[PDB]
Amino acid sequence: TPPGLQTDCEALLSRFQETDSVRFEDFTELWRNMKFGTIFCGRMRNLEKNMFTKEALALAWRYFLPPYTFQIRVGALYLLYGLYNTQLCQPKQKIRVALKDWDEVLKFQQDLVNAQHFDAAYIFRKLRLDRAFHFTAMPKLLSYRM
Amino acid sequence: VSGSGGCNFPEYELPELNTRAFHVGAFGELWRGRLRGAGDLSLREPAADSDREDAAVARDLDCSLEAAAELRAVCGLDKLKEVIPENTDLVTLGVRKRFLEHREETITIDRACRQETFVYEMESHAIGKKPENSADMIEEGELILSVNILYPVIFHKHKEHKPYQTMLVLGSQKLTQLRDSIRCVSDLQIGGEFSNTPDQAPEHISKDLYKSAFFYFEGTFYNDKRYPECRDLSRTIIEWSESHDRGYGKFQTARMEDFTFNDLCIKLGFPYLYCHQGDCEHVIVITDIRLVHHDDCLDRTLYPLLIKKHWLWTRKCFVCKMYTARWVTNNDSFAPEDPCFFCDVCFRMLHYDSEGNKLGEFLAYPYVDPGTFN
Amino acid sequence: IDSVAVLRGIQKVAMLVQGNWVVKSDILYPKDSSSPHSGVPAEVLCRGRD
Amino acid sequence: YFKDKVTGVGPPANEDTREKAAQGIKAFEELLVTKWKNWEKALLRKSVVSDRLQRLLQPKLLKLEYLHQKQSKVSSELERQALEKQGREAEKEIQDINQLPEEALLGNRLDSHDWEKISNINFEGSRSAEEIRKFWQNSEHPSINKQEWSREEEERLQAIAAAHGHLEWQKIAEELGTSRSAFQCLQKFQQHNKALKRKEWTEEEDRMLTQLVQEMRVGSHIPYRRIVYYMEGRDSMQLIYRWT
Amino acid sequence: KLFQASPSVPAKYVEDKEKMLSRTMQLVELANETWLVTGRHPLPVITAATFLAWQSLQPADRLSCSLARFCKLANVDLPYPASSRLQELLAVLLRMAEQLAWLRVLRLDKRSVVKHIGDLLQHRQSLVRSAFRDLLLPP
Amino acid sequence: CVVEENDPIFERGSTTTYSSFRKNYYSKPWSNKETDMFFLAISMVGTDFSMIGQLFPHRARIEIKNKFKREEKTNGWRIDKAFQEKRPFDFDFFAHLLQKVLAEEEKRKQK
Structure with a gap:
């Protein structure tokens, strides 16, 4: 895994805890200060940045696992949505989702729509409208050689 | 016998290392029933446009008819800041600065990514590839399967088997397609000897002399009988397995011209084994399986893709060191070592006079360099 | 059975004489065998028969 | 575990492998050529000198043992003194053989030596019999001039090669009087030769150059090695200008 | 069981019973004459x-x-x-090998000496005589 | 009937077996401070093997016997020196010193 991102995710997660509620206005206020979308352009665009954004999306969705608190769930969801929506590079790297992980998001979306959080459900509606998921049996690929 | 034991909800056997076997064919229906998945056309449009969003959302999910949710759009699109990663307290900024520092240390230009350009081009081959005709377009929800192989041994001897290729194939295609698409330089090798007459043209490569090729997937040996010359290599594997009580249950045999990838009840990540041309072996790994997307190639016949052709070092001529070799000598009269390599111009002058008379006693064979397919 | 496949295997073990196929000497005399009447090694029999 | 799923401590073998290996289809399992090491040079030198000294001593040692047996069997004193003198001569022979400098007992390149013995005993089956035979015949031998050229033999080399027709380099190397193997002077001849390169590019060759690109080119990188393999005469250095 | 190529033994380790018996007899004779049978159990x-x-x-x-x-x-x-x-x-x-000129030049060791056992046994008499000219007792 | 309580075992090929003819009675080794406390116990009690064995839970009677015999055969001068000096019979302080030696060896094993 990219070591530099394991710290950036935890650093930006502090501002996620700083949010008072889950309403998407907090993210619009955050964007003005923590412009996480800086490296999205960088000085060079190649497989380097491709693998960079791939691993970033992967390890960020990794923080969407059940044990994380609801606020962290909303934070990770919105972060991944913004990241995917800001991918101006040639390829459109879609987030990789495991089949097992397709159970938590179900009750998550149910609780979000039942709470009348229109923005919370509209964000996922737009994500689905973009077809931004890589349906895979496992979240990552691994080999036994090492 | 029907599909062997397997659940289409893959549960790990060893966490994150392997998964239980499952009927991959059901994935094409399971995930497409759990989600409609419609929209595999890239029909994204290039006012009335917002009226469609209203007439959709106001009845699907949102109850309010007011277009207040467009805050998301105006924030994401309009408020997007040709930028340098500086003037902010982020750790990704730090790692990007470290990467840029290491680049400015030695790296002079960005054109050192040919190894990455390989995968880049092999993936671009899958985007923007329109079909030949309407009757050739892939159907919605088509299952796609990826696969890796490890043929050679030329790589590090004192190291693991990392450097080789990965492939990609469609589920609806027949297994004969995957069989004939797999490329291995072993099939280009030629039998016999050539020292008697180097001008002899290759009469028949091993691709035709030995067409037998079979797969091994959970005790299911799929043979091929398209041509009358091939043979049943599975006759020895069943005999040697049933001769002694080795614990390996009975294996079921079948043909390849009537079996599809859907009925492959196999594990992902497990190092399966595929063999062809007698004993040539290839450790295979099914890494990932997913349905068709609106960004994949639309040509179904053109999709035994070799998505990652791993680099290979072609053997240079041992004499001149400026050309690729084609002949390996044996029992040479002057070669410092028996496995010497020679090219056309060097092989002739080595042991052949002006009119082509064989000089001295030696053996030689046509060395088809693996670079032929690379 | 196809003609080419038959013609392919027969050339491995049979050698042509006067338009007729004759089995190779080494096939009838494996290297571990000898003459049943004199005991000379099969290599000698291979040369003599050929 | 890399080779085969069946790789038990004792792995089996199929019948088709016999047919595959009988028709000379050696493709990959025999191209694992490796370089040498200093310890390997020392081991080869020790093994060859020991083989020669053993072949020299064995008859003398056997004759000394036979003389001991005879003097232990015979009883006459005159014959005893005769055999004692014979064993003293043999003793001095063994002594001057053991005290022989290690340059004369090296023989020549093609000297009679048991290569299988040195390969299986000394090298412990690390190097094949021929792999050490050739290495001692051409690569490792004091009769091989290790000094480099003086840019004064290539002219005579190519003159004799043109007078003979480039048929047998061995005779050319022997007549040139360089005291080096043919493969040692040919590497420099073909390095100084000019026929290796090509000249101004024609129009028909552009067709092949574009075909070899449309057929196996990859993105911004062009594998010019494939062109060098297919297109003769063109090296790797200046062949990139054909596409730059 | 090293004499037969049973399924439990790789074919590489198999050997001829007669040659092995002869070699072991020569080895134990070299041991017998060098005081390696007195006091110590024979089996080891x-x-x-x-x-x-x-x-x-x-x-x-x-x-x-x-x-x-x-x-x-x-x-x-x-x-x-x-x-x-x-x-x-x-x-x-x-x-013993130290006396043989070629072996003494080899500068063998406890491990690499096993291969040259043939030459040693071939001339064991003079070799052990020379070795005892420079007996065996407990360390 | 037993329900899988024992595991099969191969034992003796019924073929030529080695003639051991030896029973190596396991004897616990002797530590330096352990030997010192044993010497002072001798000096305090004398040559009574029963009392020494009683006050030595870490050792056995035969072990003390062999150790004393070896010290006599090897270090008889130290035996005589210890027998010359005397010290008030100590059964309680002897147990305290035994616990101290136990703690010392536990520390030495921790290191």
């Missing part, structure tokens, strides 16, 4: 001798093995002092 000396013989018949694929590996392969309980007897016999063989 015989095991060390037969192990050295089995090794010397094919040092290529057997020198890497050890006495314990050989005993396990042969399915025979190895005598405890077999290691000491093997070490003493290897030391005796080394001392």
Whole structure:
């Protein structure tokens, strides 16, 4: 895994805890200060940045696992949505989702729509409208050689 | 016998290392029933446009008819800041600065990514590839399967088997397609000897002399009988397995011209084994399986893709060191070592006079360099 | 059975004489065998028969 | 575990492998050529000198043992003194053989030596019999001039090669009087030769150059090695200008 | 069981019973004359001798093995002092090789000496005579 | 009937077996401070093997016997020196010193 991102995710997660509620206005206020979308352009665009954004999306969705608190769930969801929506590079790297992980998001979306959080459900509606998921049996690929 | 034991909800056997076997064919229906998945056309449009969003959302999910949710759009699109990663307290900024520092240390230009350009081009081959005709377009929800192989041994001897290729194939295609698409330089090798007459043209490569090729997937040996010359290599594997009580249950045999990838009840990540041309072996790994997307190639016949052709070092001529070799000598009269390599111009002058008379006693064979397919 | 496949295997073990196929000497005399009447090694029999 | 799923401590073998290996289809399992090491040079030198000294001593040692047996069997004193003198001569022979400098007992390149013995005993089956035979015949031998050229033999080399027709380099190397193997002077001849390169590019060759690109080119990188393999005469250095 | 190529033993370790018996007899005779049969149990000396013989018949694929590996392969309980007897016999063989000009030039060691056991046994008489001209007693 | 309580075992090939003819009675080794406390126990009690064995839970009677015999055969001068000096019979302080030696060896094993 990219070591530099394991710290950036935890650093930006502090501002996620700083949010008072889950309403998407907090993210619009955050964007003005923590412009996480800086490296999205960088000085060079190649497989380097491709693998960079791939691993970033992967390890960020990794923080969407059940044990994380609801606020962290909303934070990770919105972060991944913004990241995917800001991918101006040639390829459109879609987030990789495991089949097992397709159970938590179900009750998550149910609780979000039942709470009348229109923005919370509209964000996922737009994500689905973009077809931004890589349906895979496992979240990552691994080999036994090492 | 029907599909062997397997659940289409893959549960790990060893966490994150392997998964239980499952009927991959059901994935094409399971995930497409759990989600409609419609929209595999890239029909994204290039006012009335917002009226469609209203007439959709106001009845699907949102109850309010007011277009207040467009805050998301105006924030994401309009408020997007040709930028340098500086003037902010982020750790990704730090790692990007470290990467840029290491680049400015030695790296002079960005054109050192040919190894990455390989995968880049092999993936671009899958985007923007329109079909030949309407009757050739892939159907919605088509299952796609990826696969890796490890043929050679030329790589590090004192190291693991990392450097080789990965492939990609469609589920609806027949297994004969995957069989004939797999490329291995072993099939280009030629039998016999050539020292008697180097001008002899290759009469028949091993691709035709030995067409037998079979797969091994959970005790299911799929043979091929398209041509009358091939043979049943599975006759020895069943005999040697049933001769002694080795614990390996009975294996079921079948043909390849009537079996599809859907009925492959196999594990992902497990190092399966595929063999062809007698004993040539290839450790295979099914890494990932997913349905068709609106960004994949639309040509179904053109999709035994070799998505990652791993680099290979072609053997240079041992004499001149400026050309690729084609002949390996044996029992040479002057070669410092028996496995010497020679090219056309060097092989002739080595042991052949002006009119082509064989000089001295030696053996030689046509060395088809693996670079032929690379 | 196809003609080419038959013609392919027969050339491995049979050698042509006067338009007729004759089995190779080494096939009838494996290297571990000898003459049943004199005991000379099969290599000698291979040369003599050929 | 890399080779085969069946790789038990004792792995089996199929019948088709016999047919595959009988028709000379050696493709990959025999191209694992490796370089040498200093310890390997020392081991080869020790093994060859020991083989020669053993072949020299064995008859003398056997004759000394036979003389001991005879003097232990015979009883006459005159014959005893005769055999004692014979064993003293043999003793001095063994002594001057053991005290022989290690340059004369090296023989020549093609000297009679048991290569299988040195390969299986000394090298412990690390190097094949021929792999050490050739290495001692051409690569490792004091009769091989290790000094480099003086840019004064290539002219005579190519003159004799043109007078003979480039048929047998061995005779050319022997007549040139360089005291080096043919493969040692040919590497420099073909390095100084000019026929290796090509000249101004024609129009028909552009067709092949574009075909070899449309057929196996990859993105911004062009594998010019494939062109060098297919297109003769063109090296790797200046062949990139054909596409730059 | 090393004489037959049973399924439990790789074919590489198999050897001829007559040649192995002869080699072990020569080895134990060298031991007998060098005071390696007095006081010490015979079984360990015989095991060390037969192990050295089995090794010397094919040092290529057997020198890497050890006495314990050989005993396990042969399915025979190895005598405890077999290691000491093997070490003493290897030391005796080394001392003998020092007299042979070519072997003394080889500068062999406890491990690489096993392969040259043939030449040592061929001229064991003069070699042991010279070695005793420079006896054997407990360390 | 037993329900899988024992595991099969191969034992003796019924073939030529090694003639051990030896029973190596396991004897616990002797530590330096342990030997010192044993010497002072001798000096305090004398040559009564029963009392020494009683006050030595870490050792056995035969072990003390062999140790005393070896010290006599090897270090008889130290035996006589210890027998010359005397010290008030100590059964309680002897147990305290035994616990101290136990703690010392536990520390030495921790290191």
